Design a protein around this ligand. Structure first.
Ligand code: HEM
Ligand code: 4MI
Length: 393
């Protein structure tokens, strides 16, 4: 049978320390039922990977939040890529894959690297930073909106709106109702910024629009894809970088290894993505009755995937609670898995790689310099404040 648990994965206590409850979720069985929200849940690597790699049984077109779009009206027009299934998902997926492709990385790498190095040097002209306010947020705010091709102003909308989106994937708790209620202004700005005239060419958004004459996407779809990049392209990377700095502070041996060989920077970042999993959870909806882990789930049921749990499953990872910058990270689900696997993962890995490389070449020590404060969000895991003293190299 399926065990029934009262754990609330969208409660502040859970956000404050999810790992005990995540173990309870893994050990209760391959498939659990969360009575708090009447949803099924999967927290082991095996089942998370199985669900992710069966997107037509466990579909996304009925929403990847708790809300089932077949039963409730979406708070915003459904995402044409995240909240779509094959075949509708194809050509937007391919378009964003070409926009955020290797070649585009070739076009943005030097700028991103210069911005990273420059921020690290600016903060060595500081010493005692809040690694969130001064580094994790500042850098992606200083590079990503430009890479999107957004006008200089209104970029401030980006952090709110993104956050809003991620709070909206959660249940109707006070975080979600907090986010959605009267968020109109952001919704306005974003809507206006997704239009071709307001996006500087050569940026990601203008390239999306540019692809509208190829027959993969139509002109009415481009603004929603620009919206997608503007919603998923900032806060996740912020929390990811904050996670990387956090780990390097908590595992000084790993910082020393990284300094010794800056070429591990990329894998360092990847390990942080596994270790903290900035995107903690995502939902699917069953399109039919389906058997998973010896249990049977009815049609039209929400299934909650615990990505961070899958990334700390001792059934899959040796020493899962240890940050190891030489760990082989292939197979982790911090970026998802399958047809929906993060189409912008090269951008995230670029930002994190160049930031951790800057730290590696320019910083000798990172020692937490105050109270660590967590940032609470229905979907995202990250830090509100990470006070550290940076000792230069
Ligand atoms: C550390 C940084 C990041 C993390 C942890 C992350 C995480 C994820 C995950 C787990 C998914 C799978 C969603 C699902 O299966 O339902 C996803 C999809 C997606 N991500 Fe990211 N992401 C990051 C950075 C970015 C960036 C920088 C961009 C864009 C510039 C981006 C844009 C997207 C988009 C558009 C999708 C939807 C892809 C699809 O549905 O086919 N993400 N991301
Ligand atoms: C994985 S977080 C995320 C991804 C995509 C979208 C979107 O397509 O709007 C929103 C959030």
């Amino acid at each position: 049978t399926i065990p029934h648990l009262a754990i609330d994965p969208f409660s502040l206590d859970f956000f404050d320390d999810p790992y005990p409850d995540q173990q309870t979720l893994r050990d209760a069985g391959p498939v659990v039922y969360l009575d708090k929200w009447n949803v099924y849940g999967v927290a082991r690597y095996a089942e998370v990977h199985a669900v992710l790699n069966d997107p037509t049984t466990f579909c996304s077109s009925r929403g990847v939040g708790l809300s089932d779009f077949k039963k409730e009206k979406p708070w915003r027009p459904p995402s044409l890529i995240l909240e779509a299934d094959p075949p509708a998902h194809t050509r937007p997926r391919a378009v964003l894959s070409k926009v955020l492709s290797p070649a585009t990385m070739k076009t943005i790498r030097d700028g991103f690297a210069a911005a990273a190095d420059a921020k690290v040097d600016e903060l060595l002209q500081r010493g005692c930073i809040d690694a969130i306010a001064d580094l994790a947020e500042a850098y992606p705010l200083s590079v990503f909106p430009d890479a999107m091709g957004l006008k200089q102003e209104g970029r401030e909308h980006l952090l709110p709106y993104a956050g809003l989106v991620f709070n909206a994937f959660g249940p109707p708790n006070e975080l979600r109702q907090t986010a959605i209620e009267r968020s109109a202004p952001h919704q306005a700005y974003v809507n206006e910024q997704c239009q071709r005239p307001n996006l500087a060419p050569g940026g990601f958004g203008a390239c999306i629009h540019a692809f509208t004459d190829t027959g993969e996407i139509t002109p009415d779809e481009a603004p929603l894809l620009v919206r997608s990049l503007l919603s998923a392209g900032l806060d996740a990377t912020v929390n990811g970088i904050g996670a990387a700095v956090y780990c390097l502070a908590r595992f000084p041996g790993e910082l020393q290894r990284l300094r010794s060989d800056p070429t591990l920077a990329r894998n360092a970042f990847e390990e942080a993505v596994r270790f903290e999993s900035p995107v903690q959870t995502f939902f699917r909806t069953t399109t039919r009755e389906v058997e998973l882990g010896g249990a049977v789930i009815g049609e039209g049921e929400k299934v909650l995937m615990f990505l961070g749990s899958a990334n700390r499953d001792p059934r899959r990872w040796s020493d899962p609670d240890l940050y190891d910058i030489t760990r082989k990270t292939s197979g982790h689900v911090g970026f998802g898995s399958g047809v929906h696997m993060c189409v912008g993962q090269l951008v995230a890995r670029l930002e994190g790689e160049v930031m951790l490389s800057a730290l590696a070449r320019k910083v000798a020590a990172i020692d937490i310099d105050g109270p660590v404060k967590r940032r609470f969000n229905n979907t995202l895991r990250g830090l509100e404040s990470l006070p550290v003293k940076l000792t230069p190299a």
